[PDB]
Amino acid sequence: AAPACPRFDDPVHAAADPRVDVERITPDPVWRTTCGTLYRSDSRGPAVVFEQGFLPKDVIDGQYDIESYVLVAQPSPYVSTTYDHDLYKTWYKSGYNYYIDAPGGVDVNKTIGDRHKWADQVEVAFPGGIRTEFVIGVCPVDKKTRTEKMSECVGNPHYEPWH
């Protein structure tokens, strides 16, 4: 039987940009307390992501309201991930399925409900993004079949297991 997950005191321990202001998050965030693998579709290549982590577009002046950010894709302090390994299949054009093992994140559907138009994305929004140490690796995606090119997956040399 699997054990329970470590719980960090800092809700944005994972942040690649610690300037994120947690008190500006609206509505009141429901933080993810599980620690399973999460995923992110991204067209940016692993040489970049493994060096930088996932940095958010705008931690200072971006859109801190999660419902707004989910509905209308504005520069924000958040990096979006999903609980769903297979969500990459519904992404048009996104070259890679990144694998993430990071503490925390805001559980979108627990925070804004599961009846909004994108509830099927089962999103976890990371305020301040995600340091490279929490990015496990990546698999490229074959666009025409919407499948992972599993012999071309790559592990992140900077990944640091923590549980």
Numbering used by the authors: 38 to 200
Sentences from the study reporting this entry:
Scabin has been cloned, expressed, and purified, and shown to harbor dual enzymatic activities (GH and ADP-ribosyltransferase). Scabin shares nearly 40% sequence identity with the Pierisin family of mARTs.
In Scabin, the Asn to Ala substitution does not perturb enzyme interaction with the NAD+ substrate, since the Michaelis-Menten constant of the N110A variant, KM(εNAD+)N110A = 66 ± 12 μM, is nearly identical to the WT value—KM(εNAD+)WT = 68 ± 3 μM. In Scabin, the Asn to Ala substitution modestly reduces the interaction with ds-DNA, since the dissociation constant of the N110A variant, KD(21bp-DNA)N110A = 82 ± 5 μM, is higher than the KD of the WT toxin of KD(21bp-DNA) = 51 ± 4 μM. The small effect of substitution with Ala on DNA-binding affinity (1.5×) may reflect the small contribution of the Asn110 H-bond to the binding energy. Notably, replacement of Asn110 with Ala severely compromised the enzyme’s ability to transfer ADP-ribose to ss-DNA, making Asn110 an important DNA-transferase residue in Scabin and the fourth member of the Scabin-NAD+-DNA bridge. Given its conservation among the Pierisin family, Asn110 is the new catalytic cornerstone for DNA substrate modification.
